[PDB]
DNA sequence: GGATGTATATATCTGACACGTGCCTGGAGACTAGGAAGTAATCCCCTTGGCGGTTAAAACGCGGGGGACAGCGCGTACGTGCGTTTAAGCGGTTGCTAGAGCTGTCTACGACCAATTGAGCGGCCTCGGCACCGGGATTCTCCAGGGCGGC
């Protein structure tokens, strides 16, 4: 069975355990339990669906198919998470 | 006697200054209308310092036990290091399409103004329901007569 699905669904596993460890090191965490990574993947996914849903709404209002950075800045500012350095 | 360390001179690289040009956006000048400042009147709320009385909350003290904290043991789960795999990162192909920018035309849609009128705000009268007063029906406590016993 060489053939398989073209699309990939485990892209939340692409946020690897060393990446989450580096994020915790930047946050100042010395010791990390083994169940941290699944919870971090879940909260990152929830945050990303919120921001991406608002940015897709901003894109669809402008009758566009691409998602610009300015829509992402709008979506983050609407959630009280203003980001500097991408225009505006 | 030969080659090495070091000083001064010359060519080249690179950020910065000034020159040039477009253009379009801000500034100068004039006019006008209305937004806001000022005025007077009326009425209601807030301020400061008091008094009186109720009463429930606040304060104080005390006993006791529940919970916070410290110490110790233990076992497991995470850190650390190394070898191996793997996929990210970069550079690249190849076409098509989405989108920004610019120009051009036009048309439907919204601003604007005048006349109108009907939906919103206040009061007035009435009804639904709750309550106060008068009258009829039902049940409970009581005073007196009859009969029996004693000296």
Please name each of the domains of chain A with its CATH number: 1-88 (1.10.20.10)
Report the C-alpha dihedral over residues A68, A70, A46, A5, rounded to 10 degrees. Answer: 10
Cβ partners under 8 Å of residue A24, min gap 6: A32, A36
| DSSP class per residue in A6-43 | SS----STTS-HHHHHHHHHHTT-S---TTHHHHHHHH
Q: Are A76 and A51 in contact (CB under 8 A)?
A: yes
Q: How far is CA A29 from the centre of its chain?
A: 21
With a CB cutoff of 8 Å and minimum separation 6, the contacts of A71 are: A55, A58, A59, A62
Q: Which nucleotide is at minimal CA–C1' distance from A32? A: B78
Footprint of strand B on the protein (CB under 7 A): A 14, 31-35, 62, 64-66, 68
Residue for token pair 């300015």: A70
Strand, coil or helix: A65? coil
Rounded, the Å distance between the CA of A49 and C1' of B110 is: 38
Distance, in Å, from the CA atom of A76 to the CA atom of A53, rounded to the nearest integer, reads 11
């Amino acid at each position: 069975a060489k053939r398989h699905r073209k699309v990939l669904r485990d892209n939340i596993q692409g946020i690897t355990k060393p990446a989450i460890r580096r994020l915790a090191r930047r946050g100042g965490v010395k010791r990390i339990s083994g169940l941290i990574y699944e919870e971090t993947r879940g909260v990152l996914k929830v945050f990303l669906e919120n921001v991406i849903r608002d940015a897709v709404t901003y894109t669809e209002h402008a009758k566009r198919k691409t998602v610009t950075a300015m829509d992402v800045v709008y979506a983050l500012k609407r959630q009280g998470r203003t980001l500097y350095g991408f225009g505006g």
